[PDB]
Symmetry: C3
Subunit: 547 residues, 3 copies
């Protein structure tokens, strides 16, 4: 009669296990599955284990192609596997899971095509002081394709002391090994907040920090800490990391290596990155370079990076990477939050890799560096080649660009100018000339042109005769030149007839020398060394355009 | 039996106030709450005040941890407060609230952690001509944390005439004083469409206009207008504002101050900003600079800005800001939409602040400026220091960069070149030498190099003798150089022995003077003044690398 | 009780019946499934459900309700989403499968704030078929701030070109609307996405038609079922950002230019690769007009690589910027394009197809990588007003290539260009002939050209009077603010003691340098008659040009 009909329509004894006809209420209801509904019957107290109920709800929802909505904060003790394009929706910002999952496994694993998680919380025990507790939050595994997590708070996954393998528990908040994984509008806060090891991910609009600063964990930092990087990337390819707020991390805010990883073609744009205990944006080789360990072709653009202890933007042994349009700065809050533990405090730094590998083919342009201590807003190490340092960089409010060696001026391109000095010597064809130490050389590199001023003051001679070159022009050794232009505009105490004047021209066999010579009517003569006394001076000016 | 059971299960007399067992149909339905359900029983006629019913629903959803969904457009007359992580979901794009909330309060105030509003509409009275009505739309308050409003039409909040305090009703569409607020995929149209006073907000992919151009409000614009900025920002920190379509505003498209405001570290990228009655993108100090009033370290990058009346991109008294890779332009639609009311029509302008504050340490590179009237693509005022104008800037389809005074070329760095002229004079060690007005000087500054050419045509003399200097080199007063090179490639009517040639070298004491001298065999002599007749001429050429 | 359970939607539940607000029935009427009464859509995925789904659509619009598609539903005519309706797919497997015929779309979206979340919109997917022609999702001219998000749109093809849109075109998603949002989608069809509206936003999509793995026979031709990832004509104020665009049968992202007036678009932070034409492609194929041009587009921060016929390509465009992009190749190029070589240039400027010049474009701060050592950037004859910035890094590719030395003064190369010329001498009377050993070198940096000239006479014919060296590349018809030349070497000239050669730019003919000499406290312009058949000198200096 009526009671029988109501049961037939899931109006009473409503279970998701039952078949109802499509015009029934029971059927309409079976489109949305709560784990509290029958036959899953999840607890709602948040203390009793719900792992079994939720796994069944998952598996049902996959089987019948229905939607899963988690309507409480549910305690679990084993990994939940979100697969087969199943979407876990959280009813509110307080729903999700709380994880007593054991070390060695994740709270949640997302895999398959187009699976993911909306909203809520995925919470670990949050005991960073504990010497036993080791957990991991969310994994997108190697099979994840266009999977996602959006709007979710993933916190409290720590693991004190470094793992030896993944089986130990690592302390990942979110670890992505998938293809095309979207992580957006999430809050992630764990030993390693977000770890990237996949391809074509998008990490957009997230808040990322493990708040080392306020943690209470004794300084100094060391490998035993429960507070590492905001983002840590190894074998990460073609990620975009945009619009994130990354601060106060135990190590670096956004890191790519370079340490058993081959990380290439990532784009890091329009992020704020600050107050980190290591580097802000950190691209670096710590393992030695190989076909399977490198950092290449990454674009760092339009970010605002400041007060990061050991440099805001740090490139070590990386190649073909671009740092364009970023504002990198410090203020006296640096001295407060890092009191006792002073860092390098550099806006933008290039350095060799751990095993000596050069920065090659990197492009640094249009950045605004502010360093009120006057540290060099950009630093360049010995060994670096093929890098371009554009003139659109503004270091007026920092120290000028610092280069570790003068040979860098011809082995890279400094459009942002570089100035230095050198001690000139003279090379007569025979005999010797010795120069007073009043004698100076100055040089400025601007792109592929170098300007030179050389003041030569002889202190003594010994039987100098024949041709004469000045030496040695910084950068120019083993280099050639398309054009060059030199004059002598002052001299004293030379043995010259009247209407004989000196002439100067780059030595085309050794283009780090300038040959000095003299007129003689309708020709010139290369006898200048015999016209020199122990009291002679001259001053030479000009420039070279090198190749 | 059956009646008593269906009542126990929520199948009849369904209410969210009842307790039901978890396998009941009632428990299932209670996961989602419509204010039309018992015990809220909101009116659906769109005309009856529902404030009380909706607030009950909201307090219930907070108490019990359930989803709220507005299923109609709902009249209200007091502020709805969305707190405690509650999300308001609008069932369709027609759902939401219509506000008759009175002056001094908002329609919707959002606060706490992870609270927000999806979809639908939030409509003011939309009476911009009214001299009485005053309303405010959505507020995120000082305790809002990672709250959001996404996908929502917020319109019609107006207030004719300026407010004296917030109590008066201001005419904000959306006003964010929160931390980490998201505003995305909204349409905001109100007197101040969007106001920013918080930290780490994300204003993404919105449509922003109060449609001044078609409003019918009588011109000229004045302080009494009901149409002000699209985005108005005071005390805004670490915002990213990206992908917005911003236009036709009564004042500026996107503005930061500087007028009761300490606005720093914001990123404005990839927006389109056009047809505004003040400026496109506007950063300036209207009130005096202080530790609590300033605009610092903002990034303006990749934007398309056009046909804004009083300039596309405007920087006034601001420091350490950048303007990189923007396309800024005008066409003949300027004079249609602004007929009768010409404004600056500059693509990128720097200015002093209102109280004369200098633009310091700004970076302008890689921008394309198109001005078919030939107005300077970029304008630099007197007082600006530490700024860098890159050579990546393309002003070929506009006027060339205009500087207010020549001394700017050595207090800033113009890689984008600046060319001018000056009248040379001769300073003899003794007597006087007077130049014809045919004598010319020209300088071109490129980065920290200035090239010069001077033509010296003497008109008279008065007992000249001793050394000679040409003066004064533009920009070079009180400056020093690391290298330079000058020659004299033409002379006429001078008192020179056979083989004696003129030499020229920068005065190292006063480095805006070029010392002119000549050869005497194996030394040189500084007696050029006396070698000079009243008909003497020479031409000097060279460059100075200044520090 | 049964009468009340009927009156409260607890029994015979239908969206047609009216219930009061406290009823269960009312609560359920907020969310509409087409499988619910009175629509009763089939669930087998093979029965046609058009009538059922359209009825549901009109209903949800009529009553202001939410429509959720809870299965994959076969259709045979266009579903029209209007009046602010959001279609919401219950899961990633729900949606529609289209056997709609040629000349119409599976789903059409229109009016204000209408859209589609999630699921699939799936075509016949028969790209080998010489009959089947379909189109996927249209936003028409009346779409206003509509959207599709979260959706897989695939399998819409049409072998052979259409004559009109009524033939069926092979579009995946086609946007003709204002302020359209296409995001988090997967689009894979003949033309994966097509753009012809205004102020659209195309964000974080995956876009490809997988030509490389298609098995369609090469070479490519107009008969192919694999064209562009993004095709734009009459496209204004789009942002295209965060997309993975790859392996397309024509270009990854294309604006024209071919019956299209496309302006003020921003293309940023996309990855673009392995396409069979160009990566990012902006050009005029039809002739330039007031309704056919491509203007003021921004290309910025992209990573483009191994695109067969050039990574970034501008042809006859104006006011466009290419800034901070990373453009590169590697040896995989030779693998995926074996038997079909292309240009293999990272960034190239060309004329439009009817000879139109690239005007007023901006190239700066790009990193180009080419192991073949092809020119990172190529500039054609005719280009005017372009600025190539010194922030570009080509150290790992070949240096910038210009087709003609004229370019150095009609554009601004801050990225320096070096070249050479044969000098001649131009004596006031007679003739001096130079050895072929004579050389002329130039480098242009900005609006400065630096020159080295070695002049080596081989024979004379009674020369006299003034002397000019000519012709300085680029300087024909130009003027200069400043110049500086010296002569630092000479042999075998007829010069008295204390007479040296001077040189200065010829101010009447500013591609010439006047050579002359000292004579006490004046100079004399008599140098031609001081030369012999074995005379030599070398001239150096620079011109700043206006
Ligand atoms: C700075 C001054 O400014 C003006 O006054 C003048 O220009 C003046 O000349 C000038 O001084 C010169 O500055 C040079 C040094 O520049 C500074 O910049 C460099 C980088 O270019 C350093 O940052 C330097 O700091 C010191 O050296 C570093 C190495 C120390 O940090 C340690 O780094 C370790 C390596 O780890 C990292 O690298 C790997 C890849 O290999 C991964 O990416 C990692 O993620 C990354 O962290 C790290 O393991 C250790 O724990 C340390 O953090 C740093 O402590 C400090 O000692 C900085 O001062 C100088 O060369 C010249 O001599 C002048 O002094
Ligand atoms: C431009 C031409 O190009 C070629 O032909 C040649 O190079 C030629 O030399 C050249 O001319 C010269 O260029 C200068 C012209 O300057 C133009 O650029 C400046 C800025 O650099 C101005 O835009 C100028 O316009 C005038 O001056 C401004 C100030 C007037 O606007 C008023 O501004 C008030 C303040 O408000 C704003 O500022 C505050 C902060 O202080 C906040 O940010 C606000 O939000 C912001 O709106 C405002 O209250 C008033 O209502 C006005 O809007 C403007 O009306 C106009 O008077 C423009 O011409 C010149 O220096 C030189 O003499 C040659 O003319
Ligand atoms: C490359 C070397 O590098 C260093 O070693 C040295 O510097 C050395 O000098 C150097 O050589 C020089 O390279 C010059 C440039 O050559 C290459 O770059 C150009 C562009 O700058 C070309 O890509 C060139 O390839 C040829 O010419 C093009 C036109 C051919 O492609 C065809 O394009 C047709 C039109 O379609 C396109 O344009 C329209 C707009 O009109 C739309 O945008 C379309 O979407 C777009 O596809 C197309 O229909 C046809 O199917 C073709 O694809 C190409 O086939 C090829 O012939 C490339 O080699 C060089 O000029 C100089 O001679 C030196 O050799």
């Amino acid at each position: 009669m009526l009671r029988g009909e109501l049961n037939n329509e899931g109006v009473i004894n409503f279970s998701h296990a039952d078949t109802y006809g499509n015009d029934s209420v029971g059927a309409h209801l079976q489109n949305v599955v709560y784990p509290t509904d029958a036959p899953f019957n999840a607890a709602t107290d948040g203390t009793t284990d719900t792992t079994v109920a939720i796994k069944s709800a998952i598996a049902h929802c996959i089987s019948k192609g229905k939607k899963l909505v988690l309507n409480h904060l549910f305690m679990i003790t084993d990994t939940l596997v979100i697969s087969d394009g199943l979407h876990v929706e959280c009813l509110t910002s307080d729903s999700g899971v709380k994880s007593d999952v054991p070390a060695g496994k994740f709270a949640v694993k997302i895999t398959g095509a187009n699976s993911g998680w909306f909203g809520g919380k995925i919470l670990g025990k949050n005991l960073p002081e504990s010497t036993t507790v080791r957990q991991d939050g969310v994994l997108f595994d190697e099979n994840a394709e266009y999977c996602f997590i959006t709007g979710t708070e993933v916190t409290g996954f720590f693991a004190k002391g470094l793992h030896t393998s993944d089986a130990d528990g690592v302390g990942y908040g979110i670890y992505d090994k998938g293809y095309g994984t979207l992580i957006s509008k999430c809050y992630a806060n764990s030993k390693f907040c977000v770890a990237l090891g996949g391809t074509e991910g998008r990490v957009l609009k997230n808040r990322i920090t493990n708040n080392y600063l306020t943690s209470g964990e004794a300084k100094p930092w060391s490998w035993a800490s429960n507070y590492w990087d905001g983002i840590v990337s190894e074998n990460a390819h073609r990620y975009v990391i945009a619009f994130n707020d990354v601060s106060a991390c135990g190590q670096s805010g956004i890191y790519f290596g370079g340490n058993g990883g081959y990380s290439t073609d990532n784009i890091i744009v329009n992020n704020t990155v600050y107050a980190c205990w290591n580097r802000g944006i950190d691209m670096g080789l710590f393992s030695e370079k190989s076909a399977t360990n490198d950092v290449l072709r990454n674009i760092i653009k339009g970010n605002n990076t400041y007060n990061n202890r050991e440099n805001n933007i740090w490139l070590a042994g990386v190649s073909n990477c671009s740092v364009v349009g970023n504002t990198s700065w410090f203020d006296t809050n640096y001295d407060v939050i890092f009191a006792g533990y002073p860092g390098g405090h550099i806006c933008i730094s290039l350095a060799s890799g751990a095993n000596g590998e050069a920065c090659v083919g990197n492009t640094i342009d249009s950045n605004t560096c502010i360093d009120p201590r006057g540290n060099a807003g950009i630093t360049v190490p010995t060994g670096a080649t093929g890098n371009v340092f554009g003139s659109g960089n503004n270091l007026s409010q920092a120290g000028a660009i610092y280069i570790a060696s003068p040979d860098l001026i011809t082995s890279n391109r400094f459009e942002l100018a570089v100035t230095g000095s050198f001690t000139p010597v003279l090379l007569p064809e025979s005999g010797s000339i010795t120069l007073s130490s009043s004698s100076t050389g100055v040089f400025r590199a601007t792109g592929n042109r170098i300007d030179f001023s050389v003041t030569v003051n002889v202190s003594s001679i010994s039987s100098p005769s024949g041709n004469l070159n000045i030496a040695y022009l910084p950068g120019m050794s083993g280099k050639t030149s398309s054009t060059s232009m030199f004059i002598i505009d002052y001299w004293n105490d030379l043995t010259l007839s009247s209407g004989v004047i000196p002439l100067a021209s780059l030595n085309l066999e050794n283009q780090d020398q300038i040959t000095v010579y003299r007129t003689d009517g309708g020709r010139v003569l290369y006898d200048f060394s015999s016209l020199m006394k122990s009291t002679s001076s001259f001053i030479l000016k000009g420039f070279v355009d090198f190749n």
